[PDB]
């Protein structure tokens, strides 16, 4: 499946490495765009964005984003009043659509205050879901704009997907790339732990069913998630504990993008 998301961040303190306002967009869990109060310019976060988008898209969508920077800083200054809050407080936003398999589409739009969910938009009921009393005042005010709610339902249902498909084809060379893994197995001494390791593959999806003897999967294992190497590729590891005195052999059975591999286990 694929997904397109746009985030927004308003914070009460411009303390360094976290500007007052931040807005980043993500395609299929990959950064594409960026904006913050420091640059005040929407910039690409991928080579296949500045190449397939002419200067007008970047020029006009900052003019909008600066309008959203003031709007978003204002909504944070509103919530801090209703809680009599002061100091530092974070105001977040997540919106986007994902085109799944089977063709079914989804849409979502939710806000967050101090990490916790604040209000969530329901495009199929044209209503907002409030979390506390303050969020209910926001519901009773945002709902009073039938033009607004219909516009968003249009964007989530009809127009966001057009951006997603337009973005997938642009960076099809990077987003649909296939890099096979590098599998090595190492040994660790107990105070008998055999590791199966993989580096430098891309799709972030791999199966490491670690076998035993000839044809018996080993029950007890350990797992580590797909940690990003930072060059665009991902890595993983998985460590069985061999029986102290059994003298049964082991194998790894790494499968990745339809290419299984079998390895020895010292």
């Amino acid at each position, epitope marked *: 499946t694929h997904s397109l998301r746009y985030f927004r961040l308003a914070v009460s303190d411009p303390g360094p490495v976290v500007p007052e306002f931040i807005s980043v967009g993500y395609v299929d869990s990959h950064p594409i765009t960026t904006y913050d109060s420091v640059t005040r310019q929407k910039e690409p976060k991928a080579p296949w964005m500045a190449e397939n988008l002419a200067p*007008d*898209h970047w020029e*006009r*969508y900052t*003019q*909008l984003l*600066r*309008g959203w920077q*003031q*709007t978003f800083k204002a909504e944070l200054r509103h919530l801090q009043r209703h809680y009599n809050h002061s100091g530092l407080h974070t105001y977040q936003r997540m919106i986007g659509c994902e085109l799944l398999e089977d063709g079914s589409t989804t849409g979502f739009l939710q806000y967050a205050y101090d990490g916790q969910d604040f209000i969530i938009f329901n495009k199929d009921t044209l209503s907002w879901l409030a979390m506390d009393y303050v969020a209910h005042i926001t519901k009773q005010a945002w709902e009073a*704009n039938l*033009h*607004e709610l*219909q*516009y*968003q*339902k*249009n*964007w989530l249902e*009809e*127009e966001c997907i*057009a951006w997603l498909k337009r973005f997938l084809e642009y960076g099809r060379d990077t987003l649909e790339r296939t890099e096979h893994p590098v599998v090595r197995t190492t040994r660790k001494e107990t105070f008998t732990t055999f590791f199966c390791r993989a580096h430098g593959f891309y799709p972030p999806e791999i199966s490491m069913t670690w076998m035993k003897n000839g044809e018996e999967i080993a029950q007890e294992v350990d797992y580590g998630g797909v940690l990003p190497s930072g060059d665009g590729t991902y890595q993983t590891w998985l460590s069985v504990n061999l029986d102290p005195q059994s003298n049964d052999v082991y194998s790894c059975h790494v499968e990745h993008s339809g290419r299984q591999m079998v390895l020895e286990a010292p």
Partner: antibody
Amino acid sequence: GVEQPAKLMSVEGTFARVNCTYSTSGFNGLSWYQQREGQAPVFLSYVVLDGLKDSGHFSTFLSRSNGYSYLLLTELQIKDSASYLCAVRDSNYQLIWGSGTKLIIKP
Amino acid sequence: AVTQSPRNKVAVTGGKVTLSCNQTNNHNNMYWYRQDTGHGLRLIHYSYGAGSTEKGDIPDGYKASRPSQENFSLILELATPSQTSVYFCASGDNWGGAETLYFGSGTRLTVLE
């Protein structure tokens, strides 16, 4: 990108339908405005979904696929004598203003 | 609501003309248009906030500034013929895709040799 007729005649009472056809890159909404011969335009209605907005005084139906909308002005009078301007929003949020339809009402 | 000054103007080719606008509506969006016979309203300059002037479809010969939140002024450094039209000033509720523009009374500008 937006094409709109420029003349319309109808009988006092009765009703009229000013039309607006868009060919924008995307679609984020369609707004109707009424300009009374040297006065400033006045907002009339906004449509972005498929259905018609039954406001009693008027109605506005939209067609996403066919790509057009019409404003069903009814119970006409001297006040309903103006030109009508429709504006559609681009995929990058640019207002595309049509020329305008002069709806003259027959006494 | 939204007013324009001057309501009318007659200036010579190559003159300083400043068309200003004022809004009681506490909107942060203000636009400048010119409605001409034939092609409809054409945006010139606007702003999303104080000191946030940007350009539009026809920024040729026009320059704009926004001193305060309730003032957005169109400055014609060198006036010319064919810059003569009806200039409408509009405010905008920051509703994103939905937008109800509130137009002010027109300004008939005429540039004569």
